[PDB]
Amino acid sequence: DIDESSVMQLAEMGFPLEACRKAVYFTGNMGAEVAFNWIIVHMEEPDFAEPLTMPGYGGAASAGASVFGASGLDNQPPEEIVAIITSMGFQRNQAIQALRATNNNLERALDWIFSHPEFEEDSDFV
């Protein structure tokens, strides 16, 4: 009779078109297509149907927010410091290794690195 199937069809793909509800009753049972038409002609109306209630039509809405990248990009020591360390004369990767142990502590990295001459010397003699 007043087949609310028609209004729900509009609703479940767009907005709560209670305007369709009364439209189906108003149209005189002309089918969903006809009440769909009643709505698309009255779409101009702002508040003919609650425009702040999405019953089912997202896709573009529900996606995400890729602002953090892949979350924690790589686990390499501070390139600033690894740079400084290899600028001290050490190896960048060696600086990385050191900072790995020192927990990105620059000075301690050099500390860690310094105790590794090359083949462990004895030419200190202090």
Curated annotation (Swiss-Prot):
Subcellular location: Cytoplasm
Tissue: Highly expressed in ovary and testes.
Annotated phenotype, changing M13E: Impairs ability to stabilize SIAH2 and STAT1. Abolishes ability to stabilize SIAH2 and STAT1
Subunit structure: Interacts with UFD1. Interacts (via UBA domains) with SIAH2 (when ubiquitinated). Interacts with BAG6; the interaction is direct and may mediate UBL4A deubiquitination. Interacts (via UBA 2 domain) with AMFR; the interaction is direct. Interacts with UBL4A; may be indirect via BAG6. Interacts with NEDD4.
Function comment: Deubiquitinase that mediates deubiquitination of target proteins such as BECN1, MITF, SKP2 and USP10 and is involved in various processes such as autophagy, endoplasmic reticulum-associated degradation (ERAD), cell cycle progression or DNA damage response. Component of a regulatory loop that controls autophagy and p53/TP53 levels: mediates deubiquitination of BECN1, a key regulator of autophagy, leading to stabilize the PIK3C3/VPS34-containing complexes. Alternatively, forms with NEDD4 a deubiquitination complex, which subsequently stabilizes VPS34 to promote autophagy.
Domain comment (free text): The UBP-type zinc finger has lost its ability to bind ubiquitin and USP13 is not activated by unanchored ubiquitin. Swapping with the UBP-type zinc finger from USP5 restores ability to bind unanchored ubiquitin and subsequent activation of the protein. The UBA domains mediate binding to ubiquitin.
Family: Belongs to the peptidase C19 family.
Protein name: Ubiquitin carboxyl-terminal hydrolase 13
Name of the gene this protein is made from: USP13
Coverage span on the entire protein: 652 to 777 of 863
